[PDB]
């Protein structure tokens, strides 16, 4: 189900107008890592991926942390693209995220704000 | 296998050289993909035990492709034993009847990962 989900949003990518990929071993890795990386030309984009049965989304500091790092040393901006049982992927910049103590969170007062793909696309013409 | 050990081992010096890079898992798409805030790598990683190198046209293609697509320089990397990792574009393979292929006339001209980041190397 989940790399069908994932691959579900690589194929959501590419019909966007990004060439996208998945990155191998983002679990196991030595290096900073995304789950999904993806670029065209103008916008790149390093994701990592959650599917939720409901929210809200609760992720921790270092995933964040190394997403972000990965990020600045790519060239990339850095994003939470999450799954609702009968949502589309809807995605979250970094700044977008709500700080707990420990750990950073998606819930129901910033689901809404979250962007479709075209719109993630279209921030760089503003 | 191997294959992915050769991959790591790019993979580390990419980091080393100021990119940061991944390994693709599994649509054209190469084998690593890096970037380092204003440029970006499409890779297709290749070790061999001796030259040539032979890559079917379809590699080829869907790796300009890919490159096209992500905004992205396209590059063959070979591994020899016993010798740098070199960093061919693919304007750089020769192209035969139905194949392209890196050989000894060609594998000279190939660059070292200090001119793929254009930078000083130590
Ligand atoms: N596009
Ligand atoms: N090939």
Redesign the pocket.
């Known amino acids: 189900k989940g790399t069908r989900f994932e691959r579900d949003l690589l194929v959501e990518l590419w019909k ?2 990004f060439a996208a990929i998945r990155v191998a071993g983002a679990g196991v890795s030595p290096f900073p890592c995304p789950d999904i990386v993806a670029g ?1 030309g103008r916008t790149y984009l390093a994701i990592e991926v959650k599917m939720r049965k409901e929210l809200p989304l609760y992720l921790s500091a270092d995933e964040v942390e190394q997403l972000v790092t990965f990020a600045r040393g790519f060239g990339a901006e850095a994003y939470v693209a999450l799954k609702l049982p009968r949502a589309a992927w809807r995605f979250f910049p970094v700044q977008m995220l709500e700080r707990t103590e420990k750990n950073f969170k998606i819930d129901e007062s910033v689901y809404p704000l979250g962007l479709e793909i075209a719109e993630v ?1 279209g921030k760089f013409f503003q």
């Open positions: 966007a107008g065209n696309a």
